[PDB]
Design a protein around this ligand. Structure first.
Ligand SMILES: COc1ccc(S(=O)(=O)N(Cc2cccnc2)[C@@H](C(=O)NO)C(C)C)cc1
Ligand SMILES: [Ca+2]
Ligand SMILES: [Zn+2]
Ligand SMILES: [Zn+2]
Length: 169
């Protein structure tokens, strides 16, 4: 409410649910990529995530093709590779992935885990940055290893706070 059309999550815990797995890759590989991404964000923040198989989740993930009842249809391999809505009630928090391209689990054409991590940044209220090491890169590019940069760590920690509890066990 304080922000016009871009409210932050007032909850310290969030839930998510995958509507379906793309036939390009099984669920074991996709669950790992989605689960690994949540761990990276929780590792540096006291935030906690939990997958729900029933009820509406705060962040819904689904794959779409061509027009899917939206005002931004994909135009072939060109255009954006994925998109989402600002964090808010209703369709807000939802995130769609372009299923017209083939997803891979390596440095092949595109990295699914790298894109999922970027979509979460949008759901976490993180905007694009001009830092080369920031995963929130506007266009798609090839980065070295997948790791959070100091700018991203300070940004999410600044909004909520620092994880004053680095207990691995
Ligand atoms: C790995 O991180 C990334 C995630 C998504 C993309 S994306 O090409 O789909 N894209 C960036 C874009 C494309 C074309 C022209 N202007 C801007 C969306 C975007 O920024 N998504 O986060 C946007 C246009 C909907 C790029 C990188
Ligand atoms: Ca495309
Ligand atoms: Zn969509
Ligand atoms: Zn983006």
């Amino acid at each position: 409410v304080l922000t016009e059309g871009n409210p932050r999550w007032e909850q310290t815990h969030l839930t998510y649910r995958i509507e379906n797995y793309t036939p390009d890759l099984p669920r074991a590989d996709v669950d790992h990529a989605i689960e690994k991404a949540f761990q990276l964000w929780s590792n540096v923040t006291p935030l906690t995530f939990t997958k729900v198989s029933e009820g509406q989740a705060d962040i819904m993930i689904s794959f779409v093709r061509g027009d899917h009842r939206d005002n931004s249809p994909f135009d072939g391999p060109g255009g954006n590779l994925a998109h989402a809505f600002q964090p808010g009630p209703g369709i807000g928090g939802d995130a769609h992935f372009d299923e017209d391209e083939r997803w891979t689990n390596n440095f092949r054409e595109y990295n699914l885990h790298r894109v999922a991590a970027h979509e979460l940044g949008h759901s976490l209220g993180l905007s694009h940055s001009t830092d080369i090491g920031a995963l929130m890169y506007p266009s798609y590019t090839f980065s070295g290893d997948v790791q959070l940069a100091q700018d991203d760590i300070d940004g999410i920690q600044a909004i909520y706070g620092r994880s004053q509890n680095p207990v691995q066990p």
